[model samples]
Target: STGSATTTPIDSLDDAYITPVQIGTPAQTLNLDFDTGSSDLWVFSSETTASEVDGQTIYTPSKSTTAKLLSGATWSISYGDGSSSSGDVYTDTVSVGGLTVTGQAVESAKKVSSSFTEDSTIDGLLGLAFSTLNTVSPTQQKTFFDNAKASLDSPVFTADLGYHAPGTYNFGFIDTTAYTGSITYTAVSTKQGFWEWTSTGYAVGSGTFKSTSIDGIADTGTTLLYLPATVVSAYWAQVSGAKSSSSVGGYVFPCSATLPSFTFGVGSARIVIPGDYIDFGPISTGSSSCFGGIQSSAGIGINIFGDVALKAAFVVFNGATTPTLGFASK
Candidate 1:
């Protein structure tokens, strides 16, 4: 293990380890949720009250032969959605495919709210985002990257998202041959999380997204694909049945059902966002709806392409290189 603050380098493919964990215990293996959004590790704990969880993977250290607790440390986290969870720290010996790592950081929920909670399949979130914005701070912020960087034969952990399977959010490296030969690399900024980025400019279908031209940022943490108002208006006006409606979150439209093929330009390169993202109907009650991606966060702030669009491609990040991002198709 390298005694450094940076992530371990991906010198070769074998240097990467598949750091997967089983929910509950080895006795009852639970498939967990692996998210690239916010970087944090959370799991249903034996201490979780019946009111807090239902039909979820609950980890019981007593039952998990590989579990251990971090004495005197507490955990509390807040999400962009405003939901929260609090608990104690524990370490577990986890295995992913052929890789195994000991003393991995974990959060055992003592108290949790529905806000940050999801399906039982969301047993845990193996954050491959970043060490910054890590819910736990400085000394206490123990991440999979941090642990694996030091302990693994190689410090790199690649997230092999299963495009064939929408829910296949795999950790560590899979067959790279499955991806397109081309890989795009962008410079990284010390914003926050991996999402905070600056765009050279925006475009549509190989054309400029903004007539005035502006710098852009790509965010993996944000689910809604945010765009400039000028650009959005220009694009939506062309889509059939596309109408702007205001709700709890932002501008939502019925176009999700229309299926529009729109592409956003980053620098000179253009990336298309499948219309399914735009065609999304309402998720909440009332007429308020959720599009595949939102058009609001436009003038309010920087544009972010969260999981909604990220699911479309296979992405790779090499923080070991700093200010530089590497991406490829799955």
Candidate 2:
């Protein structure tokens, strides 16, 4: 079976993409962040403390007759943004779009950090990474995508992330109509349980393309394009008045500065991110300084091709065989 779901940017945050997912027998719908960077389907639930629930909708497992406790299993997760969530596990029916997975591990949060509690719109996170990365006690759980892959028409999913607009995440089938030009395929390295791939090189705005491999992960959950400090410095160097601000954090530049486009080489395919996208708006309250969307992933270890970079192209996460990434201009 094939299914597709719509994801939209929350309040123009552009940080994460949220899609509606149904849980339980009768289908308790919740807006979950479809994060390819992590592998867990967790949600604010009845088990969550009232203080941690905030304005978010919590999924009540008791409402679903089919729900079953996983017998002392628990899960805890912490994100790079410092958001954390912990919960007990339950086996229940979970469905996305038209694809359904029975007995999918649904981690119902018993506790959530302030970052999650304050976010009223996001109910939970639906991870699309490999099952090996799932976090659960005693036994690792399988993601919804993995559990349903066998029944899918094709073992593939496509992410079409639009800038400050609506996007679609199609599963089991690739919609050729969604992209233009030939889709360029790249072999992936899932050793880290991420859709990690290497770009043959990158160039700063009309500059010469460097022939160095930059290893990075295709993360839908992250907002900015984080690269090496050297690479980040190179891009910002071309822009006048760009500096690493201590107060503002990351590379900041004058809002009025004309920015240059950034290009990444996937084999011979070039994915050029427009300069305008690099200027991620003002840094502080009513300030003329803007924070660069492309920052240095100095401490993060691996670079991240976040929303800013992914929005420039259509991405196909093909789970078939060795797993590959297909990129095409939107």
Candidate 3:
């Protein structure tokens, strides 16, 4: 049977979406961040030090009769944001929505960095990137989607990440009602274990689209839209009183400043980002300054179309042959 799951943004942190997943025999449910940037299904578990875990839920493998240790197998991963988690591996029955996969590798955390430990809600992370990127030693483990793909009617999944509201992730089947208008398709390069694609060009405000090629990945875990340094400067230049703030570590502008919208080219389709979305809240309470939601991807090498950009349109992580990405107006 096909599988699907609905995920919601954390009320406090609107950056990532969390979905319920079941692991082991009796099914210990955990709220996991569905990240497309990296490949690893890891969670806080009984192996984690109690001090490291605040109010987060822990998955106990020993309680499940179906759980089997992968003997000496281990995994460790550090994200672009500096968050990290590492642990031993256990093979167990893992289920998402209604689809179940037996003998799935579930990394139980023995250690987590402050970035993760300080967050009391996120129990773990479920990687949606290619299986080749899995961190398991000796043998790379297949992700949940990879293990279940053979049984699916079609090898595909759609990520409908919404802003502030609930969104759904459908596997093996596309829910046509989630998006409007024709879905614009663009070829992706999976060689990097990411849904990397190149935009034909981009435009700022009411300007015409430029002819520059923009290479980036659709990263749901990242909160901001990062573009090339030159492009970022162009956008900020259009905003009155906008300046790159060393104190803020990003471009900032007056709270009441009228900002320009951004448009990125995907094949022939031009996806527009509203000006209002660029204001990433005030820099501090009662402050007249605000941080920009768009920044320079200078040192990062590749631009990241994170939640801010992805939420502007309905995105489909089409996993059919060649893995094309389809975007449309929501």
Candidate 4:
């Protein structure tokens, strides 16, 4: 079987993408962020306090006859120091698009962090990375895709993230028409449970492609394209008004400047991110300075080819025994 879900950018900034996920037999819909960088499907639920609930939708397990608590199973997701959400687990029917998975583990949030509550548009996250990265303890569970793979015609998924537009998350089979040109396939290293792959090199604007190895992850969960300082500085240098601003907290440029497009190589193919996408809006509503969508990942410890890069191409996350990633121009 095959299923495809539409993912739309939540805001004008294209900050994150949201896909509708229906949980439980009664069908409770929640806007979830499909994260390819992590493995933990968690959601805001009735167990979370009212103060932390805000305007986001919650999953009430008690309302569903098919919901069953997984005894002694607990999960704690910590993205930063002292910033976390910990809770118990429940097994319920989960649906995305037309595909359904029965008895899928759904982590219900009992306590959440300020970020989770502040992000009202995102009810939760649907993890697409390897199950080994799941936060559930005592007995880690597989991700929604992991559980649904066996029932599908193919154990794979594709991400088509658009800039300020609705894209798609196609499971089971690849839509050949969804992308243009041929795909360049590369081996993915799941040692750390990430869709980790290596890019051959990058080019600024219409410049020559540098033949350098850039190890990175196809992270839909992250909003920006983060490369090393060496590569980031090179790109911004091409823009006359671009500068490193403390007030903006990173690289910024004049709102009216004609920014150069960034190109990254995947095997022999090159994926180009339009300059329009790089002009990441203004610092504020009517500010004159705009932040660069491509930034330095020096302190992050890893190169992240996030949505900014992924949006420029069609990404295939192959879940075969020997995992591999495919990229194609769109």
lDDT of 3 at 317: 83
Candidates in order have lDDT scores of 0.54, 0.91, 0.88, 0.92
* lDDT per residue (tens digit) for residues 1-330 in model 3: 688998888764366688999998899999999888888999999999888999899999999999999998999998997778898999999888888899999999999999888877789999888888999997899998888888887887778877678888888887788888888999999998998999889999999889889999998878889999999999999998999987888899999998899999899898888887777768988999988989989988889999878888878887776788888877
State, as a TM-score between 0 and 1, how close model 2 is to the true structure: 0.97
Which stretches of candidate 3 lie above 4 Å from their native place?
none
Model 4 lDDT tens row, 1-330: 888999999999899999999999799999999999888899999998789988999999999889999999999987512457889999999999999999999999998999888988999989998999999989999999999999889989999999889999999999999999998999899988899999999999999999999999999998899999999999999988899887767899998899889999998889999988887888888999888999988888899998999999999999988999999999
Runs in model 1 lying further than 4 Å from the true structure? 1-20, 23-28, 116-118, 137-139, 150-164, 167-174, 204-222, 255-257, 282-290, 298-302, 321-323
Q: Write the per-residue lDDT of candidate 1 for residues 81-187, one digit (tens) a residue.
A: 57678788777865554345567777778877784354444455566567675665334665666666544444444443322232232233434564575656666
TM-score to native of every candidate shown: 0.77, 0.97, 0.95, 0.97
Each prediction's RMSD over C-alphas, in Å, is 7.1, 1.1, 1.5, 1.3
Count of backbone clashes for each model?
Answer: 16, 0, 0, 0
lDDT of 1 at 76: 76
Error of 4 at 208 (Å): 1.1
For model 1, the local distance difference test gives 0.54
